[PDB]
Amino acid sequence: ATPLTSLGSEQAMFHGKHQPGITTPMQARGHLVAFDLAAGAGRKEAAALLRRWSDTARRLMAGEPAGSRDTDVARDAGPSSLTVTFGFGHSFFGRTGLEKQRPVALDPLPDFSSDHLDKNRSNGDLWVQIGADDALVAFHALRAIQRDAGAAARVRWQMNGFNRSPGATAHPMTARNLMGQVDGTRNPKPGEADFDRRIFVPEPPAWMANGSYVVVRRIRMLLDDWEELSLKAQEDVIGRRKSDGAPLSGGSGATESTEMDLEKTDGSGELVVPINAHARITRPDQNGGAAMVRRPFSYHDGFDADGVPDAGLLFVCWQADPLRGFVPVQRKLDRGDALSQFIRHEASGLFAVPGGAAEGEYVGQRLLEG
Amino acid sequence: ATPLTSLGSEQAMFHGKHQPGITTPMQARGHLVAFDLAAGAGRKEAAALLRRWSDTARRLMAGEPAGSRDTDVARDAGPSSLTVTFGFGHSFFGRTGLEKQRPVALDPLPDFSSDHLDKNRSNGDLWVQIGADDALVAFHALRAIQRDAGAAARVRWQMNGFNRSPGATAHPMTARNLMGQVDGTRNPKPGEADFDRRIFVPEGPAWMANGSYVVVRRIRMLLDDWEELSLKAQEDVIGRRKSDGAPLSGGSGATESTEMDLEKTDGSGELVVPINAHARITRPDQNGGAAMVRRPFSYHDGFDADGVPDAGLLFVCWQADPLRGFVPVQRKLDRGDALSQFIRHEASGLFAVPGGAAEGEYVGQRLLEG
Ligand code: HEM
């Protein structure tokens, strides 16, 4: 039996080959933040900031108070699966005399025809992902990281999200999103032969060894439109059942794990999984092997004057190279996906997330020490 | 040993003498929403709305889907302690020909000198409180309630909140707030002799029988100033220790439940619990018996362009009469409370929350039938 107390007592590793928050299980609470370096902050100031942040992250992920006078907001709680993950934006390198170390992988994402990006709420020099299963643990961490930045960097944008909690279901199962879909069934996962090739920069720029590239997209769901559709219409947009996430090509004994049949046709000769269904056209085998790990949070930030919900998905994906992951898939989806009609990409960021800190190190040390 | 599945499996009762969400334990996720009646919505349209809303609440609190057009967002989750609670504002009665039934208890709150209220995110004809320990369960309920409003009402304002998750601590403990304080120790509970008298209208206008009056305050915490204080300074603002919630008058053996000594002085003759300490001056015995149940959520909605967090407490208190609860205590706190310097009241609502629905009834039926 899994005890209730495991929610708090579960602890993620800070030190490791890879940073936490990539293969870590889904967390109930998320805070994404971007910071811009202050005028006059260069390499040396940036290195000091990453040391402060890494010292803080190490402490908080072990359920210990912050290095400087802790607020007590997380006191009483266990680590609650807190993770803190750090990335660097294209713009960071030009602020710190590190242009020669800027990866080609940080070249700007395309201007997709369906983009509706608030550029002020996009991009940024530095990115931090905080997640935990307790909201006080998570907020405490956000606040400590943000306070560590002080005058050295300002908050450029900051978004809040959530997911299903541990124990909400009778047994662990794939999460849902605010469209009601089963979301998370098909991802690359650790132990697959090609997982590292797909997701992480290998050990043989050198500072990104064992790192990954994240693309963040704030995707509003057009729930007012979506929720007027029939079930058949909604399932045809994805190619999978809302009940259990099974492919539409499955019968009654099909489950979430049943393999999709992309050739199956009904009695009229029409494909059972539609030609433009999201879960057809996003597959690696439909994109020359293009692949990513998806690890999102859902969001809801209110209603506008007409009752339209500011709700959707904080889409967060991980890949060794955006040109073999997010970019080619999104080029296809832009106009090609049945889902595009029902969503709006409203903010974006692409960040280089290095390998995990070893004992005594700070995240990004190889970059900033050189 | 309490299993993790209890987070999802626990179920609150909808039907009863009192509405749920008053004495119910704290929940990890909250949504507060106010609605204004649309043009063309009078008594009969409001009665139909409360019928819809009550049926939605009944189903969803039992872990069932909505009666029709369910979105599947909560599917597979247990009830996760979902509660839905309904109230009526002062403005409701003049929109529905029900002025004769408007309780005196809904008379407008004082304009306190410390108020900085957003009129547009304050008050409203109707209020709904949604809470649960799973965020998908909670969102699904918010969306269902909001979609039941249809042509009858528009969202006036809506706020998100959070608290500690079940299982975050190694055993059940009093909550904390974003100032890092123990918060909730001296909350009145069923089983204390004056509880029913303090909190519920007795078996006012008859339609309010077994109801309670809620005052909602969106109180921003001035965390930038608060977190520059010493521990000693912070503990003097409240009169209780941050570590364990004990009164400052207590010894090293004292805990949160240790009775406060209001006369105790130090070696220089100065009061150990300061004269203007929040946890001194808010006591019923310092306010001629004025008392309330407090059952809040914390909030954080991001950062403004200047780096200031929009974070604080959704203060939600319950009393049989605001003039014997919130009102006289807040008159005293307004300028008198050491805490006032570090908080800002930025929205407010006062709602009449009637008794619970009996089997075969809807909430507010004694008011609205006709
Ligand atoms: C709000 C926006 C989106 C929604 C609601 C959504 C929903 C889903 C759903 C329901 C599935 C099927 C279950 C699963 O395997 O996870 C799925 C699969 C997937 N989606 Fe999305 N998706 C969104 C955006 C994106 C974007 C922007 C990309 C990439 C550019 C993407 C890439 C994928 C991939 C790669 C799969 C797995 C395909 C496979 O190998 O089976 N999705 N999505």
Ligand code: HEM
């Ligand atoms: C963000 C704003 C506020 C914060 C941070 C705060 C914090 C606290 C803390 C830490 C305690 C002591 C522990 C406890 O017994 O719960 C407490 C007690 C209390 N507060 Fe507040 N408070 C706030 C606003 C208010 C307001 C607006 C009122 C009423 C108008 C209020 C009424 C009370 C009462 C009645 C008690 C219990 C006193 C007793 O009988 O021991 N508080 N508050």
